[PDB]
Design an enzyme around this catalytic site. Structure first.
Site, PDB file in Angstrom:
ATOM      1  N   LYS C 143       0.847  -1.191   0.000  1.00  0.00           N
ATOM      2  CA  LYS C 143       0.000   0.000   0.000  1.00  0.00           C
ATOM      3  C   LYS C 143       0.889   1.249   0.000  1.00  0.00           C
ATOM      4  CE  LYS C 143      -3.268  -2.592   2.879  1.00  0.00           C
ATOM      5  NZ  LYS C 143      -3.125  -3.083   4.269  1.00  0.00           N
ATOM      6  N   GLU C 169      -5.338   6.110  12.252  1.00  0.00           N
ATOM      7  CA  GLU C 169      -4.197   5.289  11.886  1.00  0.00           C
ATOM      8  C   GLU C 169      -3.559   4.733  13.165  1.00  0.00           C
ATOM      9  OE1 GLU C 169      -2.056   3.606   8.726  1.00  0.00           O
ATOM     10  OE2 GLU C 169      -3.909   4.775   8.777  1.00  0.00           O
ATOM     11  N   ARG C 170      -2.746   3.686  13.013  1.00  0.00           N
ATOM     12  CA  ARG C 170      -1.770   3.289  14.038  1.00  0.00           C
ATOM     13  C   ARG C 170      -0.651   4.335  14.072  1.00  0.00           C
ATOM     14  NH1 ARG C 170      -3.810  -0.895  11.367  1.00  0.00           N
ATOM     15  NH2 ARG C 170      -4.551  -2.722  12.522  1.00  0.00           N
TER      16      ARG C 170
END
Ligand SMILES: Nc1ncnc2c1ncn2[C@@H]1O[C@H](COP(=O)(O)OP(=O)(O)O)[C@@H](O)[C@H]1O
Ligand SMILES: Nc1ncnc2c1ncn2[C@@H]1O[C@H](COP(=O)(O)OP(=O)(O)O)[C@@H](O)[C@H]1O
Ligand SMILES: [Mg+2]
Ligand SMILES: [Mg+2]
Lengths: 464, 48, 448, 481
Positions: C143, C169-170
């Site tokens: 990705k 997000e992380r």
């Protein structure tokens, strides 16, 4: 009279004052934003905001218009792009029209109607032949996303080159622009009104969008003129009303919808009708759209609209991908009016067409007799296939179907059927225009014309 | 040769059956969530 | 100035003097016993304003002073934003300010193909200017390598900048992305906005707006095609549900907010092409329960033009980028928009690859021998087509070794035309592997 | 000072306390503590952290002037404590002056480093397929009696890194048995046990994870590595649901509040790998979620799955069928991946995942023996034997060097001659032989962190020699062909 806002939020506003305010009356906030008085409480007035409510606060002053929800109407709207309220967005001057109509009006009664016996030609072979649409009829266009629901409606509008009213609900702006562009290219915008309540707009606009488009059409209807309205789509308008009801804290039911979600679509669609001779004899045809999820016809909102409308045109994903475009499922799709909304020419040739193709699909799944039926059926499918933005005249359709049904394409390969159709029509257009002219006027295929066509086909086959 | 044909159709039918049940499952899954919440929220609104 | 009355989680009620009540969606600051930013939501009455907190509400007290800015949450804009890291509020996390909230352009005013350079995309799933692309991929497949490529290519070729938006997000992945962009030296032409899962739902709601607002100015003023990378767009809708419940809105189908389509509509419609220039949004979309009928993913699909499905099977072979040619699709693939030739070649390639995939089961047991003369050739061509779809990436210099290659549309169409006809049947399978132009195919053919 | 107006169900509304802080510790007049959550217009909603039987209307409550904090240090190692940090084991008091707040902000984007340090669980299935690094968050999710706790206990035993076993909504006898298991293995000395059992109020269950995290953070910031285990967040979620509903907060999906996702988010994010500038300490997380009928689609599971850095889905069908641990290979994932693996494991178990993905695809054909070709038959025979290697008995963590050899054996096809049922015993006896005689091979792998070409040829000869010696349990024996 003047009132003051006490509470505000989520596109809802409680107003102090306005003691003699009417129900469903148009109110005006001090920023120029409009509102609708729904709930007249003991010591407050619950109002829904038709616009942005970011600059609507506690203490802001609201005034009465003294008019129950109404929108201007006339010939001025033709070739214009407007919002539910009736303000032009295209940017081509204001709408000069003194005549107005209320959004909420009662539909024609039992006595104030006449049986639908006037064809409205979509210009699509599959529809006109199998599932015909008459003037005053309500034909649902239902199916998954990217099945060609909008395309059918646009092609229908192009074929009227009858006043058109393309109502866009919860649509992206770029799509509405592309639809307008398509009408300009074809040259069908001049007799087409475009009501637009895009996704950015509040729930109120989406909720109102169909009622405004219907009101515009009714003006022509009562004057004794024919109209076609297109809702694209009622699925999003239902979702919009669900949002409003849930915010107002109305108790939810099946699929989190309010009780009167069926009633919402009912009053809208019923207003589409064919009036009696006493009331002019005008019409107002409806083409509502519903977006199914994984071809789920059983879902709540689809079933509601299906039970209201006068037949449905179910589009399939599997058929669309396989090459059948438009992807109308013959077995499931139906026309409730039927032969009444067809000219005698089409009625004769396409009398048992839907039955033959229903047998074909059954046989396809699995002799001399059966082999011939499959070869015939396969070729009939190729005729029903039609390219986008290419409406055919009724006289051209009947000839194309007559060719296939009688078995004039049996000798020709299946892949060459599409080109055979195109070149044949070009030949008849050029040389044998009298055959087309005959069908236009009489609205019937004579025994002479039948024998004429046979000879024309045979002669062309040799040349082909 | 006949088995090839017989089992090919059986596999195609199985594919179709899976798709129909999977939709029915998701229909129920979404419904059960919607139904439970409406009862919970219904009880909450009853008091205040 | 105001005074805090009630606090219930991230919801805060504030009193104000009679006719000096802040407008809706206005940012209110309050000192913690750090500065907490509150955004107005509802007007309760008696000059009470219910607000949604953009940070944890731990340490607040009743009667604390709350200052009104007199405008919605402002965020920085311009060339200074490039090569920096920001939050939802628009504060630098690496140590003009316009409002995030604004309506999109009118649809009549909006202008009615985005050449990437990649063969697989341009042919089988071409992207749209001002359109919405969806990047499907498994765990650690490719990705970020692809997003870095799209930055590199459109920054280099077209000259346009990019804006990344880590919506829930992380924080670990954000750190990994930072170092990845730093090594590639593409930080300079990329703006980063982060509103990770750690933060309350208020942030995840608005974080998307902040990143979009920055992109809109690059679009409007600078006059260039800007990229917008959103991961993940679902988490905005998820955050929408979380706030909706706490605000006291009755839930809709599958326990989502009643204004799901509206909230999404306001965001997605801003991401659009104007006459001046466009913004191309490469979004990631979560699908709960692998259920596409779920309202969240069901509503999103209405907005989107194109899809790119990365598969592990193609990644395991060593085909980069590992785009699934059959599963991946694009709406604009029609004879009207792109001409008849492109459409003909695109579908013909899909036909060959589809038949190859069907014969996998038979080839697994019996092999090539049992296939007919025609099928034998189709399989040979199919394998060569699969390997030709592989291409060198500019970003992937550290991975492969060789520099990347950009292939124009005309080169792409002509190449697959010759492959389908069977003009390159003599050439070996290795000749097609990891090449751009047709000249490089013939050059590598001689060496082998 | 304030006065209680309403009381019941572990909740109390208080008059007064005009300048009370949010999440401030309050003290009732019997010595019982409370937490001010909701600061209303003319009241203060407080949750009671204790018995509320002698808390009534009219009773006086005082301010402490402090946000929730708990003592921390080396004293907690080998002790059993409650959320508040009071010892329940009955082995003296906890001598520690250092304290930490429960609610603290997690490391920022700049204050982190990429996870590139393996944390060996000692389980072949996990370490090989779904590796866990220092600072990573790996979810352990599955039905009841699937072996979720077992994996965590085995992980803690293998560290013989500081451990923090947080028990939420657990029965006392289970926590006692876990403590007993650690004593037997001898892993309790470096293990802190936070316990909020079922009998305790909802407040304890709600706090239990935050207290365990705070204890771990002390080591993290000092530049030392920690492992925390939440068993489990499903019950902690249910506890918070109870509190919110009692406080009359509006419910959402599955009757949960809006900030049930936010609850787990702040908790798990605090687990991280710090930068070199801030020492370079770590804090690995092993949260647990209890699914119902293998429903991954449920609200609370999906929430935690979207937060954590990979998941280890356990199945009931696999567990009952004999696959223990019952980790579903296809669904389970590691987001860090090869970065959290030594080069030795990366090479051998690089295409282990691919072989087993092919096996499951083929598996259907296996029943129909000798109706297939040669290539597919070999893959089935190989795959079947690989499954037996992944099987591992309870409370038996293997060293990394022992795992690599066991996988190298199967992958290269050294077990192809040996029957499938005798693979488990072959593995055990082989490792015993290599441990005794060929310790140099293990030592080489430990130091170099790779398998040499010399070691490969050594192993081949060792295997062949052992095969000859190995008496096959079922039927006749077979060495090579
Ligand atoms: N008759 C047709 N033949 C071929 N393609 C068509 C036809 N009608 C529609 N399409 C294709 O279907 C796509 C979507 O059409 P649209 O009417 O917008 O479907 P929906 O209403 O389901 O979104 C278009 O890109 C168009 O190319
Ligand atoms: N790898 C294994 N091999 C054999 N038995 C096991 C294994 N893992 C767990 N068990 C047994 O199965 C039971 C699983 O129960 P438990 O650990 O409580 O699962 P959960 O924590 O998911 O409810 C344990 O009591 C343990 O004795
Ligand atoms: Mg449409
Ligand atoms: Mg357990």
């Amino acid at each position: 009279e003047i009132g003051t806002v006490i509470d505000a939020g989520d596109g809802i506003a409680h107003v102090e004052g306005l003691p003699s305010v009417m129900t469903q009356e148009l109110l005006e906030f001090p920023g120029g934003v409009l509102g609708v008085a729904l709930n007249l409480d003991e010591h407050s007035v619950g109002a829904v905001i038709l616009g942005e409510f970011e600059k609507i606060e506690e203490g802001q002053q609201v005034k009465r218009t003294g008019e129950v929800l109404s929108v201007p109407v006339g010939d001025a709207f033709l070739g214009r792009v407007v919002n539910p309220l009736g303000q032009p967005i295209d940017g081509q001057g204001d709408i000069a029209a003194e005549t107005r109509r209320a959004l909420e009006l009662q539909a024609p009664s039992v006595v104030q109607r006449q049986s639908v016996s006037e064809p409205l030609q979509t210009g699509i072979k599959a529809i006109d032949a199998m599932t015909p649409i008459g003037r005053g009829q309500r034909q649902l266009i239902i199916g998954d996303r990217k099945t060609g629901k909008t395309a059918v409606c646009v092609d229908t509008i192009l074929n009227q080159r009858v006043r058109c009213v393309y109502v866009a609900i919860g649509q992206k702006g770029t799509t509405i622009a592309s639809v307008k562009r398509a009408l300009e290219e074809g040259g069908a915008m001049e007799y087409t009104t475009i009501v637009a309540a895009p996704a950015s707009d509040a729930a109120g606009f989406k909720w109102l969008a169909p009622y405004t488009g219907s009101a515009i059409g009714q003006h022509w209807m009562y004057n004794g003129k024919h109209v076609l309205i297109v809702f694209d789509d009622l699925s999003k308008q239902a979702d919009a009303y669900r949002a409003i009801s849930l915010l107002l804290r109305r108790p939810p039911g099946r699929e989190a919808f309010p009780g009167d979600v069926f009633y919402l679509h009912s009053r809208l669609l019923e207003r589409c009708a064919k009036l009696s001779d006493e009331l002019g004899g005008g019409s107002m045809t409806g083409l509502p759209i519903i977006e199914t999820k994984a071809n789920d016809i059983s879902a709540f909102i689809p079933t509601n609209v299906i039970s209201i409308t006068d037949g449905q045109c179910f589009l399939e994903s599997d058929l669309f991908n396989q090459g059948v475009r438009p992807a109308i499922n013959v077995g499931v799709s139906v026309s409730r009016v039927g032969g009444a909304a067809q000219i005698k020419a089409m009625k004769e040739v396409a009398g048992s067409l839907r039955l033959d193709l229903s047998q074909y699909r059954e046989l396809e799944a699995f002799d001399a007799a059966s082999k011939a039926q499959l070869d015939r059926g396969a070729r009939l499918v190729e005729l029903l296939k039609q390219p986008q933005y290419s409406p055919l005249a009724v006289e051209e359709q009947v000839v194309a179907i007559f060719l296939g049904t009688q078995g004039h394409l049996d000798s020709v390969p299946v892949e060459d059927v599409q080109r055979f159709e195109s070149e044949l029509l070009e030949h008849v257009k050029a040389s044998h225009s009298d055959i087309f002219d005959g069908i236009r006027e009489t609205k019937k295929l004579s025994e002479e014309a039948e024998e004429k066509l046979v000879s024309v086909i045979n002669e062309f086959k040799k040349g082909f | 040769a006949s088995r090839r044909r017989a089992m090919k159709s059986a596999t195609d039918n199985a594919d179709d059956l899976i798709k129909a049940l999977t939709l029915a499952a998701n229909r129920e899954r979404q419904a059960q969530i919607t139904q439970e919440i409406s009862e919970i929220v219904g009880g909450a609104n009853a008091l205040a | 100035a105001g005074r805090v009355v009630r606090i219930t989680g991230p919801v805060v009620d504030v009193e104000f003097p009679r006719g000096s009540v802040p407008e809706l969606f206005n940012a209110l600051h309050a000192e913690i016993t750090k500065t907490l930013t509150l955004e107005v939501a509802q007007h309760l009455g008696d000059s009470l304003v219910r607000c949604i907190s953009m940070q944890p509400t731990d340490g607040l007290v009743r009667g604390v002073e709350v200052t009104d800015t007199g405008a919605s949450i402002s965020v920085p804009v311009g060339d200074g934003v490039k090569g920096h890291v920001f939050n939802a509020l628009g504060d630098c996390l690496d140590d003009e300010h316009w409002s995030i909230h604004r309506k999109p352009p009118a649809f009549s005013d909006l202008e009615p193909m985005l050449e990437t350079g990649l063969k697989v995309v341009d042919l089988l799933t071409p992207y749209v200017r001002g359109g919405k692309i969806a990047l499907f991929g498994g765990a650690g497949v490719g990705k970020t390598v692809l997003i870095q490529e799209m930055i590199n290519r459109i920054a280099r070729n077209f000259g346009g900048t990019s804006v990344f938006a880590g919506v829930g997000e992380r924080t670990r992945e954000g750190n990994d992305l930072w170092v990845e962009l730093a090594d590639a030296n593409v930080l300079k032409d990329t703006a980063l906005v982060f509103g990770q899962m750690d933060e309350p739902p208020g942030t995840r709601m608005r974080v998307a707006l902040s990143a979009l607002t920055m992109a809109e100015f690059f679009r409007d003023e600078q006059g260039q095609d800007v990229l917008l990378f959103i991961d993940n767009i679902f988490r905005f809708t998820q955050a929408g549900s979380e706030v909706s419940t706490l605000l006291g809105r009755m839930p809709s189908a599958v326990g989502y907010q009643p204004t799901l389509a509206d909230e999404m509509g306001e965001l997605q419609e801003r991401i659009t092409s104007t006459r001046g220039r466009s913004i191309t949004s490469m979004q990631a979309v979560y699908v709960p329960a692998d259920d596409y009928t779920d309202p969240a993913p069901a509503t999103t699909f209405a907005h989107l033009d194109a899809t790119t499905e990365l598969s592990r099977a193609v990644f395991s072979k060593g085909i980069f980028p590992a785009v699934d040619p059959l599963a991946s699709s694009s709406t604009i693939l029609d004879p009207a928009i792109v001409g008849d030739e492109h459409y003909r070649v695109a579908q013909e390639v899909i036909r060959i690859l589809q038949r190859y995939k069907d014969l996998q089961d038979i080839i697994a047991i019996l092999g090539i021998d049992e296939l007919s003369e025609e099928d034998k050739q189709l399989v040979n061509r199919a394998r060569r087509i699969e390997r030709f779809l592989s291409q060198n990436m500019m970003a992937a210099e550290q991975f492969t070794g060789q520099p990347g290659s950009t292939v124009p549309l005309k080169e792409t169409i002509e190449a697959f035309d010759k492959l389908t006809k069977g003009e390159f049947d003599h050439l070996p399978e290795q000749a097609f592997f990891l090449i751009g132009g047709l000249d490089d195919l013939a050059k590598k053919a001689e060496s082998l």
